[PDB]
Amino acid sequence: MKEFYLTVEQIGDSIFERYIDSNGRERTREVEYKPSLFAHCPESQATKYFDIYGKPCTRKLFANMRDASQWIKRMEDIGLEALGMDDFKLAYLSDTYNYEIKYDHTKIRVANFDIEVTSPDGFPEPSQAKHPIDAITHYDSIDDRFYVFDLLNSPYGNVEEWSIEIAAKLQEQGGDEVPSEIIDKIIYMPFDNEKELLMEYLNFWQQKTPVILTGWNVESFAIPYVYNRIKNIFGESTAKRLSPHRKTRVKVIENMYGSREIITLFGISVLDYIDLYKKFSFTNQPSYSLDYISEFELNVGKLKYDGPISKLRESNHQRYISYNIIAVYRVLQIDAKRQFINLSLDMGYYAKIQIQSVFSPIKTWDAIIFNSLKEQNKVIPQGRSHPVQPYPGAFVKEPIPNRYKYVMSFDLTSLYPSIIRQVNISPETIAGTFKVAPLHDYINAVAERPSDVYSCSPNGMMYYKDRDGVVPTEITKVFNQRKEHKGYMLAAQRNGEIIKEALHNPNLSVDEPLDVDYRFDFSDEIKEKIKKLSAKSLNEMLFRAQRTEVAGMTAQINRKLLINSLAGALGNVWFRYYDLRNATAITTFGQMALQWIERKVNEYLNEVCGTEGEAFVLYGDTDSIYVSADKIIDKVGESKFRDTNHWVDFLDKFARERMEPAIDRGFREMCEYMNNKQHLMFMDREAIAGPPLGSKGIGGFWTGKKRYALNVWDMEGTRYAEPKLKIMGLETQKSSTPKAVQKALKECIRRMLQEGEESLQEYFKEFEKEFRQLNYISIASVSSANNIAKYDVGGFPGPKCPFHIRGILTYNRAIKGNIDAPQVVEGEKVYVLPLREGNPFGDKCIAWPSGTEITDLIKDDVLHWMDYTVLLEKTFIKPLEGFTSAAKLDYEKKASLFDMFDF
DNA sequence: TCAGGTAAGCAGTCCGCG
DNA sequence: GCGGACTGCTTAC
Numbered sequence: 033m034k035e036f037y038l039t040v041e042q043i044g045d046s047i048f049e050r051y052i053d054s055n056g057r058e059r060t061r062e063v064e065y066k067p068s069l070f071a072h073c074p075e076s077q078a079t080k081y082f083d084i085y086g087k088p089c090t091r092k093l094f095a096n097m098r099d100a101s102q103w104i105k106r107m108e109d110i111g112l113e114a115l116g117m118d119d120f121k122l123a124y125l126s127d128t129y130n131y132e133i134k135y136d137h138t139k140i141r142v143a144n145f146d147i148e149v150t151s152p153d154g155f156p157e158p159s160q161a162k163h164p165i166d167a168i169t170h171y172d173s174i175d176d177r178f179y180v181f182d183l184l185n186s187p188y189g190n191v192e193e194w195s196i197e198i199a200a201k202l203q204e205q206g207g208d209e210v211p212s213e214i215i216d217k218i219i220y221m222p223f224d225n226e227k228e229l230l231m232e233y234l235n236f237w238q239q240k241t242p243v244i245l246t247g248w249n250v251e252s253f254a255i256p257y258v259y260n261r262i263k264n265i266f267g268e269s270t271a272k273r274l275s276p277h278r279k280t281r282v283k284v285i286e287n288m289y290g291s292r293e294i295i296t297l298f299g300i301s302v303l304d305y306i307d308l309y310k311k312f313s314f315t316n317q318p319s320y321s322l323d324y325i326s327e328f329e330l331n332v333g334k335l336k337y338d339g340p341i342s343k344l345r346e347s348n349h350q351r352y353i354s355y356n357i358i359a360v361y362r363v364l365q366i367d368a369k370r371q372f373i374n375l376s377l378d379m380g381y382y383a384k385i386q387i388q389s390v391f392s393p394i395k396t397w398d399a400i401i402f403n404s405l406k407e408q409n410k411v412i413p414q415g416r417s418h419p420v421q422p423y424p425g426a427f428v429k430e431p432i433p434n435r436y437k438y439v440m441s442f443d444l445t446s447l448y449p450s451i452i453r454q455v456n457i458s459p460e461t462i463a464g465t466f467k468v469a470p471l472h473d474y475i476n477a478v479a480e481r482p483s484d485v486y487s488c489s490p491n492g493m494m495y496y497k498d499r500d501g502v503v504p505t506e507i508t509k510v511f512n513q514r515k516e517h518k519g520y521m522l523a524a525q526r527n528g529e530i531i532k533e534a535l536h537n538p539n540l541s542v543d544e545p546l547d548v549d550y551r552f553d554f555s556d557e558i559k560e561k562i563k564k565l566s567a568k569s570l571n572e573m574l575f576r577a578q579r580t581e582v583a584g585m586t587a588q589i590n591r592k593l594l595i596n597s598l599a600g601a602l603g604n605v606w607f608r609y610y611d612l613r614n615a616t617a618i619t620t621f622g623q624m625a626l627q628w629i630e631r632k633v634n635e636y637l638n639e640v641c642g643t644e645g646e647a648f649v650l651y652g653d654t655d656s657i658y659v660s661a662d663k664i665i666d667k668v669g670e671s672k673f674r675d676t677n678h679w680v681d682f683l684d685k686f687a688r689e690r691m692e693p694a695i696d697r698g699f700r701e702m703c704e705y706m707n708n709k710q711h712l713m714f715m716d717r718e719a720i721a722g723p724p725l726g727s728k729g730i731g732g733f734w735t736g737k738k739r740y741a742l743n744v745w746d747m748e749g750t751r752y753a754e755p756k757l758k759i760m761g762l763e764t765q766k767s768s769t770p771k772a773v774q775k776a777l778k779e780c781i782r783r784m785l786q787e788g789e790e791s792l793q794e795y796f797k798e799f800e801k802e803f804r805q806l807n808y809i810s811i812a813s814v815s816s817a818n819n820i821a822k823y824d825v826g827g828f829p830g831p832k833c834p835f836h837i838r839g840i841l842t843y844n845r846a847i848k849g850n851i852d853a854p855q856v857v858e859g860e861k862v863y864v865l866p867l868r869e870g871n872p873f874g875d876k877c878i879a880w881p882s883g884t885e886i887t888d889l890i891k892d893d894v895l896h897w898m899d900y901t902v903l904l905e906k907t908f909i910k911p912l913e914g915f916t917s918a919a920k921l922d923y924e925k926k927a928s929l930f931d932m933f934d935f
Numbered sequence: 936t937c938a939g940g941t942a943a944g945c946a947g948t949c950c951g952c953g
Numbered sequence: 954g955c956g957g958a959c960t961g962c963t964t965a966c
C-alpha cells in the first residue's frame with residue numbers, strides 16, 4: 033500500500049501529520065520541516081530553478097519555518113519578491129507525497145455526531161455553554177457503530193434508560209421507528225452524571241479520533257458547545273483533548289454584517305454537512321433544518337413530537353434519544369445518496385490540500401498549480417496586494433417576448449475552460465497586446481486580424497503558441513475527469529427512461545431486479561429482460577438508476593464548478609495568479625463567440641430557407657443559442673408526421689447532420705481569425721422543444737432575459753418517456769415563491785405549453801376558487817433576512833425598511849418578553865405573510881423562522897388575519913399575468929359573440 | 936452568509952410626475 | 954399608477 037496523509041498542521045516550527053502507513057495503519061508524526069523559498073539571482077549564477085517567466089532563482093533553505101516567515105517580512109521591508117510556497121504544510125505535502133495519491137477510504141475515520149442540550153431559557157449559546165449536554169450520538173465509519181451517550185440525571189430532570197426494544201417498534205406500536213438496519217449497530221451507554229459522560233466521551237474520542245468530522249451544524253453548534261462545556265466544567269487543557277495535537281484556537285468568521293466564532297481543532301478536518309450541502313448540492317432551499325433537507329432528499333417523514341424541544345427529554349426521554357440517533361442516521365443517508373464526503377476526499381487528495389480546503393477553489397487551484405510547477409523545478413510567484421476592480425462578463429441577448437412553438441437549443445461544451453485551453457490563457461503565456469477594434473467589428477469579421485504570430489482574445493491580449501501554459505495544462509486534466517463522470521450520469525439518465533417506458537407494461541410475476549451497472553447504456557439483452565419484469569422489480573431498478581445518476585451528477589457538476597472557478601479566480605484579488613487581463617480575456621472571448629455564432633447560424637438558416645435578414649436565433653445567454661425551428665417543421669408539413677416522436681427524430685437529425693457541421697465550420701473560422709492554439713469551441717444540440725403533435729399547446733415562451741419555459745422532448749440525447757418542462761428564471765424556480773404557488777404556476781405553464789389557452793383558463797378559475805384552503809406554510813413567501821438590527825428603531829421599522837424585515841419586527845413585538853419563543857436568526861431565512869388592515873399585530877406583514885410552524889403564542893391570530901387576497905395577487909396573479917402577456921394568451925376567458933346564446 | 940466570477944431579473948421603499 | 958434611483962434578494966450562466 034502506498035502511504036497517504038490524513039491531516040496536516042503547522043504548530044510553531046513543527047509539522048504535525050496524521051497518516052496511513054504502508055501497512056494500512058494510522059500513525060502520527062512530528063517533523064521539524066525545513067522549508068525552502070526563492071529569490072531572483074543573476075543569470076551568471078548556475079541554477080536548476082526558474083520562475084514561471086524563465087528568470088533564474090536561487091533556493092534558500094531555512095533552519096525552521098519561523099525563519100522562513102521572518103525572511104518573507106524582511107524581503108517586503110527591502111522591496112523584493114519572495115518567491116515560493118509560503119504555506120509550508122502544502123510544501124510539506126508536496127515533498128512527502130511526490131506522486132498521484134491513491135487513498136483507501138476504509139482506513140479514514142469519518143465521524144458523524146449530534147448532541148442534545150435541554151435549555152429552558154431560549155437557545156443554548158455555544159459561547160456560553162451554560163446547560164448540560166444530555167445526549168451525544170457519535171457514528172464511527174471504521175467501526176460502523178452508533179455510540180450513544182445518554183445522560184440520565186440532570187438539573188432539568190432525572191429519567192429512565194432508553195429502550196432499544198421500544199425504539200425499534202413501529203410508531204403505531206408506540207415505538208420510535210429507528211430503522212431496523214441500524215438497530216444492531218447501536219452501542220448504548222447511560223450515565224448517572226454529566227462529568228462521567230464527558231470524561232468517557234473524551235476517552236472514546238482519544239481511542240477513535242475523527243479524521244473527517246461531520247454532522248449537521250457541527251461547526252457552528254455541536255463542536256463549540258462540546259468544547260466550551262468541557263472547558264467550563266474541567267478547564268482548558270481537558271477541552272483541548274478534542275484535538276489530537278492538543279491545540280485549538282477560536283477562529284473569527286467575518287461577514288459583511290457581523291461575525292461569529294468557531295473552534296479550530298488542529299489535526300481534525302471538519303466538513304460540516306450543512307456546508308457541504310450548500311456548496312455541492314446546487315439547490316437553494318427555503319429552509320436548512322435537517323428535517324427539511326431529509327424530507328427533500330429522502331422523502332422521509334418529519335420527526336414528530338409533542339410540546340417544545342425544551343420539554344421533550346422530561347416528557348418523553350425515549351423519543352428524545354431515538355430522535356438524536358435518527359438525526360445522525362439521516363446525515364449518513366443523505367451522504368449515501370449525494371456522496372459529498374467522497375467528492376471532498378477525491379478533490380482534496382488530488383490537489384494535495386487539507387481536506388477542509390475543498391471549500392476554497394482559490395486554495396485548491398493554488399496547490400494544483402504549485403505541485404504542477406514544482407515537478408518542472410519551476411518557482412511560483414509571491415502573492416501581491418490588489419485593489420478590487422469590476423470587470424466585464426458574459427453577453428445575454430434581449431429576446432422578443434413571445435410564444436415560440438418549435439425550438440432547438442445549442443450549447444458550448446465547458447465554455448470558460450475551453451476558452452482558456454483554446455486561447456492558451458495563463459500567467460506565463462502572455463506575449464503582449466494588440467490594438468483593439470470595437471467588439472462588433474470582430475463579431476462581424478471586419479476588423480483586421482489581431483496577430484499572425486500569437487493566439488488572441490478580442491480584449492487585446494496575445495498569448496504564446498509554442499507550448500501550453502500551466503493553467504491550460506491543469507484545467508484540461510480536471511475537465512477530462514468531469515467529462516468521464518458526465519458520461520456516466522447521462523447513461524444512467526437514459527437507462528432510467530428505458531425503465532420508465534417498461535413500467536407502462538409491467539408483468540404479473542414475482543421476480544428480482546437485474547444486477548447491472550447503470551453507468552453504461554443497457555445492452556439489447558438487458559432491455560429484453562426488462563420488458564419481462566414486474567412493477568416491483570422495475571421500480572427498484574428505477575430507484576437504483578436514479579441513485580447512479582445522482583452520484584454521477586455530484587462528481588460531474590462539482591468538477592465543472594472547480595474548472596469554472598479557475599476563470600473567476602483570475603479575477604479574485606487573493607489568487608496568486610490574479611490578472612484582470614486574463615480574467616477579461618476569457619469573458620470577452622465568450623461574448624464574441626456567442627455573437628459570432630449567432631451571425632453564422634442566422635446566415636446558414638437564411639440560406640437553406642432562401643430568405644434574407646431573418647432572425648432564427650431568438651435568444652442566447654453566455655454560450656447557448658435558441659433557434660426557432662418552425663420553418664424547418666413547416667417545410668415538411670405538420671400533417672406528414674405520424675406522432676410527436678417522429679418530428680423530434682427529424683429535428684434531431686437536422687441538428688446533427690446539418691446544423692452542427694455548419695456551426696463547426698463557423699467556429700473553425702473564428703479560431704483562425706483569432707489565430708488560436710487549438711480549436712475547442714464545440715457547440716452541440718441541447719434541447720428539442722415543442723407542443724405535443726395535434727394539440728393546442730404553445731411549446732414555449734420567453735418573457736425577457738433569463739426568463740423562459742420550454743416543453744422538452746429530448747435533452748442532450750435523453751429521449752424522455754414523458755415531456756419535461758424546462759423552466760428558467762420564472763417564479764416556479766425561486767425559493768422565495770410559496771411552495772403551493774410554485775406548484776400552481778408550474779401547472780399553469782404545463783397547460784400553456786402542452787394543452788393550450790382553454791386548459792389554462794380552466795385551471796386558473798379553479799385555483800382562484802380553492803386556494804384559501806391551502807395550508808398557511810404552503811402559501812407563505814420566503815426570504816433571507818440580513819441587517820435586522822439596522823432597520824430596527826425601538827422595535828419599529830426605520831427608513832427604507834425591507835418588507836420581510838418589517839415582518840420580523842412585527843413578530844418580535846408579538847413575542848416580546850418570551851424566552852421560549854423561537855427567535856429569528858440574523859442571516860437565516862423566514863416565512864413571510866401579509867396581514868389584513870386592522871390586525872392586532874399593528875402592521876401589514878409578519879415573518880417567522882422558515883421550516884417551522886409559527887409559535888402557538890400567535891398562530892391562530894396569524895391564520896385569522898392572513899391576507900389571502902394580497903397573497904394571491906402578489907405571488908400568483910402578477911407572475912401569471914407576466915407569463916400570459918408574453919405568450920399572447922388570456923388566463924381569463926374574454927367575452928365573445930356566442931355569449932348571446934348561452935344555454 | 937468564510938470559501939471563483941459577472942449579468943440581470945423582480946419586490947419593495949421613497950418620491951417625483953403639473 | 955408607473956417609473957427612476959436605490960436596496961435587497963435570487964437566479965442564469
Ligand SMILES: Cc1cn([C@H]2C[C@H](O)[C@@H](COP(=O)(O)OP(=O)(O)OP(=O)(O)O)O2)c(=O)[nH]c1=O
Binds near residue numbers: 443592966
Ligand atoms: C453554471 C455556471 C456557468 N458559469 C460560466 C462559466 C461557464 O463555462 C459558462 C457557461 O455555463 P454553462 O453552459 O452552464 O456550463 P459549461 O459550458 O461550463 O459546462 P457544460 O459542458 O455543462 O455546458 O458560464 C459560471 O461561471 N458559473 C456557473 O456556476
Ligand SMILES: [Ca+2]
Binds near residue numbers: 147356359
Ligand atoms: Ca436535536
Ligand SMILES: [Ca+2]
Binds near residue numbers: 213214217
Ligand atoms: Ca449504517
Ligand SMILES: [Ca+2]
Binds near residue numbers: 443444445446447655
Ligand atoms: Ca455550456
Ligand SMILES: [Ca+2]
Binds near residue numbers: 444445716718748
Ligand atoms: Ca452539451
Ligand SMILES: [Ca+2]
Binds near residue numbers: 538564
Ligand atoms: Ca412487460
Ligand SMILES: [Ca+2]
Binds near residue numbers: 444653
Ligand atoms: Ca449554457
Ligand SMILES: [Ca+2]
Binds near residue numbers: 443718748
Ligand atoms: Ca448542458
Ligand SMILES: [Ca+2]
Binds near residue numbers: 889892
Ligand atoms: Ca391567540
